[PDB]
Design a protein around this ligand. Structure first.
Ligand SMILES: [Mg+2]
Ligand SMILES: [Mg+2]
Ligand SMILES: [Mg+2]
Length: 65
RNA sequence: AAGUGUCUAAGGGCGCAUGGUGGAUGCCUUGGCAUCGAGAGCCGAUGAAGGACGUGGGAGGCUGCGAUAUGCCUCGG
């Protein structure tokens, strides 16, 4: 997935857009898993973890980075 | 003629032989019991103890966790 090291340079708005597009990817992966066209089922966990990473970066930024 | 004279088993008893059931005995153990030697002696409105519901690629329970959900970041091993 995406590294915290390569996430700690995006400012606030690139972070907010990465978050939104990652959520969109997770939505699409959920529908593909439901309809049976997903092969690599390890993608769900990866996308969830990168979303959690983006929240972690934003929260630590707004509380004394 | 008179007399003597067995055998058999519908079933049963006792003894063997050969099986079945059952789980005693023997020997164990990821479990307990009683202490001894050091700790630490409180937790909570900054929301506790304890829970309900959720959370995994596949059903449920335990266990971990909380919509960031068997996990996120950093520092060590
Ligand atoms: Mg007889
Ligand atoms: Mg007979
Ligand atoms: Mg390390």
């Amino acid at each position: 997935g995406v590294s915290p090291g390569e996430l700690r340079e995006l400012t606030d708005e690139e972070l907010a857009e990465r978050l939104r597009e990652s959520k969109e990817e997770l939505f699409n992966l959920r529908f593909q898993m439901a309809t049976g066209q997903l092969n690599n089922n390890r993608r769900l966990r990866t996308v969830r973890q990168e979303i959690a990473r983006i929240y972690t970066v934003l929260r630590e930024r707004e509380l004394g980075l």
